[PDB]
Structure formats: structure tokens, C-alpha cells
Amino acid sequence: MALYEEEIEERGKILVSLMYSTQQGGLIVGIIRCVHLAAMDANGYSDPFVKLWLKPDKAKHKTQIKKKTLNPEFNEEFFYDIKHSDLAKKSLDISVWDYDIGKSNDYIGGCQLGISAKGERLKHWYECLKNKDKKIERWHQLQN
Ligand SMILES: [Ca+2]
Ligand SMILES: [Ca+2]
């Protein structure tokens, strides 16, 4: 609306699955859900959606927009055609956004999963690289 209705350390957590499928020849990325997202509207909620970019590259995907929730349930899967060893060249940028109708979308937070990450985000990538045809599901902290 017109009276700033669509306008914080804890940004939320995201549950992500990674599976390299040898039958299909590529990476399946699952965006399952987020929990305790930052509220980026005055009603105390957000309208979240998630964007994926497989860097450095078809490289991009996005989820649907869920309305008025800090705990969006997406259960959506995305596919990238890629050789397994070429995943060792890439990193997946994940960003979470609050859709607004009358202004720019608000940034909730993000995380990078891939070779230029650190800590548990790096390890998640490595577990997918080391384990073909296993679904590796982990929770990550969103960062600003
Ligand atoms: Ca907003
Ligand atoms: Ca909104």
C-alpha cells in the first residue's frame, strides 16, 4: 500500500537437499522449507521466495511465492544438467526474498553452498560431490 505497509540479526534457516543423479546426469536441488524468517512487512510477516544461481554460469531458478508466512513450505525441486566432476567448479548462490506488490522486494538473507563456501556450507557440497545418488539434506543459517 502507500503508508509503508510493506516495509535484525536472526534472518532464518533454510532446509536444502542436494543429490547428484547418475541416471539423469545432473544435480537435483531441493528447497524444502524455511523457518523463522525475518519479517519484512509491517504485519509481522513476509511473502517469501527463493532464487538459485549456479555460479559462475539456465544457471538460474526460483521458487513460487508463499504468502504471509515466516515458515514457508516450498517442497520444490530443480535440476541442473552438469557432469559430476564439473560440480567441483561451481557454487550455488541461494537468496531468500520477501515479495512486495508496491515496492522493491526485500532481501531476507542468503547462503552460498559450494566450493567458495566455508564450514558446514562447504561440507554439504563436498558430501554431494563424494556421494553420487544420495540425497544430502541439511539446515543452513541465512546470512545478511
Ligand atoms: Ca516487505
Ligand atoms: Ca511482502
mmCIF file of C-alpha atoms and ligand atoms in Angstrom:
data_model
loop_
_atom_site.group_PDB
_atom_site.id
_atom_site.type_symbol
_atom_site.label_atom_id
_atom_site.label_comp_id
_atom_site.label_asym_id
_atom_site.label_seq_id
_atom_site.Cartn_x
_atom_site.Cartn_y
_atom_site.Cartn_z
ATOM 1 C CA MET A 1 0.000 0.000 0.000
ATOM 2 C CA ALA A 2 1.064 3.685 0.404
ATOM 3 C CA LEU A 3 1.762 4.030 4.154
ATOM 4 C CA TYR A 4 4.933 1.863 4.341
ATOM 5 C CA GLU A 5 2.919 -1.286 4.986
ATOM 6 C CA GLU A 6 5.342 -3.426 3.054
ATOM 7 C CA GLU A 7 8.465 -2.227 4.830
ATOM 8 C CA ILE A 8 17.591 -7.821 12.587
ATOM 9 C CA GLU A 9 20.272 -10.401 13.420
ATOM 10 C CA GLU A 10 18.189 -13.572 13.007
ATOM 11 C CA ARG A 11 17.336 -13.945 9.342
ATOM 12 C CA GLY A 12 16.014 -17.526 9.443
ATOM 13 C CA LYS A 13 17.088 -21.036 8.451
ATOM 14 C CA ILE A 14 16.627 -22.941 5.188
ATOM 15 C CA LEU A 15 16.419 -26.681 4.570
ATOM 16 C CA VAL A 16 18.160 -27.676 1.297
ATOM 17 C CA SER A 17 18.685 -31.037 -0.388
ATOM 18 C CA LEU A 18 21.407 -31.835 -2.900
ATOM 19 C CA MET A 19 21.538 -35.051 -4.974
ATOM 20 C CA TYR A 20 23.784 -35.848 -7.923
ATOM 21 C CA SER A 21 21.741 -38.264 -10.067
ATOM 22 C CA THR A 22 23.767 -40.543 -12.305
ATOM 23 C CA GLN A 23 20.643 -41.767 -14.059
ATOM 24 C CA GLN A 24 19.672 -38.198 -15.006
ATOM 25 C CA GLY A 25 23.163 -36.739 -15.385
ATOM 26 C CA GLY A 26 22.781 -33.719 -13.163
ATOM 27 C CA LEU A 27 22.217 -32.036 -9.839
ATOM 28 C CA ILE A 28 18.811 -32.003 -8.150
ATOM 29 C CA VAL A 29 18.425 -29.119 -5.686
ATOM 30 C CA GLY A 30 15.519 -29.291 -3.215
ATOM 31 C CA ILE A 31 14.258 -26.206 -1.470
ATOM 32 C CA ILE A 32 12.147 -27.789 1.267
ATOM 33 C CA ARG A 33 11.245 -25.030 3.674
ATOM 34 C CA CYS A 34 12.426 -22.081 5.680
ATOM 35 C CA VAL A 35 11.864 -21.483 9.406
ATOM 36 C CA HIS A 36 11.860 -18.210 11.455
ATOM 37 C CA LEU A 37 12.467 -15.910 8.536
ATOM 38 C CA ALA A 38 12.874 -12.225 9.275
ATOM 39 C CA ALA A 39 9.589 -10.336 8.981
ATOM 40 C CA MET A 40 9.974 -7.758 6.198
ATOM 41 C CA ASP A 41 6.360 -6.366 6.167
ATOM 42 C CA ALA A 42 4.611 -4.292 8.830
ATOM 43 C CA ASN A 43 2.117 -7.049 9.544
ATOM 44 C CA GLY A 44 4.924 -9.074 11.161
ATOM 45 C CA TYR A 45 5.209 -11.417 8.177
ATOM 46 C CA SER A 46 6.943 -11.854 4.804
ATOM 47 C CA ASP A 47 5.966 -13.230 1.381
ATOM 48 C CA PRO A 48 8.972 -15.435 0.785
ATOM 49 C CA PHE A 49 10.507 -16.878 -2.369
ATOM 50 C CA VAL A 50 13.953 -18.375 -3.051
ATOM 51 C CA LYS A 51 16.319 -17.719 -6.001
ATOM 52 C CA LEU A 52 19.053 -20.105 -7.067
ATOM 53 C CA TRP A 53 22.130 -19.270 -9.168
ATOM 54 C CA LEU A 54 24.736 -21.854 -10.074
ATOM 55 C CA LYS A 55 27.902 -19.755 -10.347
ATOM 56 C CA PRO A 56 29.734 -18.868 -12.366
ATOM 57 C CA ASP A 57 27.303 -19.607 -15.309
ATOM 58 C CA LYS A 58 19.868 -21.995 -17.494
ATOM 59 C CA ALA A 59 22.008 -21.178 -14.408
ATOM 60 C CA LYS A 60 19.021 -19.743 -12.510
ATOM 61 C CA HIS A 61 15.837 -20.992 -10.902
ATOM 62 C CA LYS A 62 13.230 -19.627 -8.490
ATOM 63 C CA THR A 63 10.535 -20.986 -6.253
ATOM 64 C CA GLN A 64 6.948 -19.861 -6.003
ATOM 65 C CA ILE A 65 5.963 -17.051 -3.674
ATOM 66 C CA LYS A 66 4.347 -18.138 -0.426
ATOM 67 C CA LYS A 67 2.073 -15.505 1.118
ATOM 68 C CA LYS A 68 2.146 -14.180 4.716
ATOM 69 C CA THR A 69 4.443 -16.641 6.411
ATOM 70 C CA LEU A 70 7.792 -16.753 8.176
ATOM 71 C CA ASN A 71 7.837 -20.559 7.822
ATOM 72 C CA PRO A 72 7.246 -21.159 4.095
ATOM 73 C CA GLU A 73 6.716 -24.761 2.959
ATOM 74 C CA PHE A 74 8.029 -24.957 -0.648
ATOM 75 C CA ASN A 75 8.877 -28.644 -1.236
ATOM 76 C CA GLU A 76 10.185 -27.758 -4.722
ATOM 77 C CA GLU A 77 12.992 -29.450 -6.713
ATOM 78 C CA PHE A 78 15.144 -28.017 -9.513
ATOM 79 C CA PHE A 79 17.556 -29.646 -11.982
ATOM 80 C CA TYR A 80 20.875 -28.636 -13.492
ATOM 81 C CA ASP A 81 22.442 -30.609 -16.376
ATOM 82 C CA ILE A 82 26.084 -30.977 -15.368
ATOM 83 C CA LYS A 83 28.817 -33.586 -15.177
ATOM 84 C CA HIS A 84 29.591 -34.609 -11.605
ATOM 85 C CA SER A 85 33.240 -33.568 -11.685
ATOM 86 C CA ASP A 86 32.160 -30.196 -13.052
ATOM 87 C CA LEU A 87 30.297 -29.530 -9.817
ATOM 88 C CA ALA A 88 33.837 -29.010 -8.412
ATOM 89 C CA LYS A 89 33.929 -25.826 -10.447
ATOM 90 C CA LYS A 90 30.682 -24.368 -9.238
ATOM 91 C CA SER A 91 28.975 -22.788 -6.265
ATOM 92 C CA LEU A 92 25.216 -22.392 -5.635
ATOM 93 C CA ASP A 93 24.087 -18.971 -4.531
ATOM 94 C CA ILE A 94 20.789 -19.170 -2.587
ATOM 95 C CA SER A 95 18.922 -15.987 -1.735
ATOM 96 C CA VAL A 96 15.640 -15.530 0.091
ATOM 97 C CA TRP A 97 13.373 -12.610 -0.714
ATOM 98 C CA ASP A 98 10.167 -11.042 0.548
ATOM 99 C CA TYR A 99 7.877 -10.244 -2.411
ATOM 100 C CA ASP A 100 6.243 -6.828 -2.261
ATOM 101 C CA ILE A 101 3.468 -5.571 -4.526
ATOM 102 C CA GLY A 102 4.171 -1.835 -4.258
ATOM 103 C CA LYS A 103 7.949 -1.648 -3.759
ATOM 104 C CA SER A 104 11.167 -3.450 -4.416
ATOM 105 C CA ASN A 105 11.341 -6.933 -2.934
ATOM 106 C CA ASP A 106 13.069 -7.057 0.454
ATOM 107 C CA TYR A 107 16.174 -9.198 0.965
ATOM 108 C CA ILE A 108 15.749 -11.676 3.823
ATOM 109 C CA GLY A 109 19.090 -13.421 3.661
ATOM 110 C CA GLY A 110 21.242 -15.886 1.736
ATOM 111 C CA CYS A 111 23.813 -18.588 1.799
ATOM 112 C CA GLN A 112 26.311 -19.938 -0.622
ATOM 113 C CA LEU A 113 26.663 -23.740 -0.930
ATOM 114 C CA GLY A 114 29.652 -24.691 -2.973
ATOM 115 C CA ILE A 115 33.403 -24.540 -3.440
ATOM 116 C CA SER A 116 33.930 -20.948 -2.267
ATOM 117 C CA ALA A 117 31.964 -21.509 0.983
ATOM 118 C CA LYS A 118 33.265 -22.242 4.488
ATOM 119 C CA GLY A 119 32.203 -24.518 7.363
ATOM 120 C CA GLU A 120 29.012 -26.561 7.104
ATOM 121 C CA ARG A 121 28.020 -24.935 3.762
ATOM 122 C CA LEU A 122 31.278 -26.198 2.202
ATOM 123 C CA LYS A 123 30.899 -29.618 3.775
ATOM 124 C CA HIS A 124 27.393 -30.029 2.367
ATOM 125 C CA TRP A 125 28.737 -29.511 -1.142
ATOM 126 C CA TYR A 126 31.543 -31.906 -0.543
ATOM 127 C CA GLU A 127 29.170 -34.598 0.688
ATOM 128 C CA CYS A 128 27.170 -34.342 -2.548
ATOM 129 C CA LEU A 129 30.432 -34.467 -4.593
ATOM 130 C CA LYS A 130 31.577 -37.547 -2.615
ATOM 131 C CA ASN A 131 28.226 -39.456 -2.724
ATOM 132 C CA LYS A 132 26.508 -39.939 -6.066
ATOM 133 C CA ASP A 133 22.819 -40.915 -5.916
ATOM 134 C CA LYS A 134 22.408 -39.980 -2.226
ATOM 135 C CA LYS A 135 20.088 -37.150 -1.143
ATOM 136 C CA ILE A 136 22.043 -34.885 1.212
ATOM 137 C CA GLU A 137 19.668 -32.675 3.256
ATOM 138 C CA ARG A 138 20.925 -30.025 5.639
ATOM 139 C CA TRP A 139 19.780 -26.912 7.504
ATOM 140 C CA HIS A 140 21.680 -23.669 6.910
ATOM 141 C CA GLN A 141 21.700 -20.322 8.602
ATOM 142 C CA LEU A 142 20.750 -17.411 6.385
ATOM 143 C CA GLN A 143 23.254 -14.567 6.382
ATOM 144 C CA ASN A 144 22.817 -10.932 5.531
HETATM 145 CA CA CA B 1 8.420 -6.019 2.526
HETATM 146 CA CA CA B 2 5.845 -8.591 1.360
#
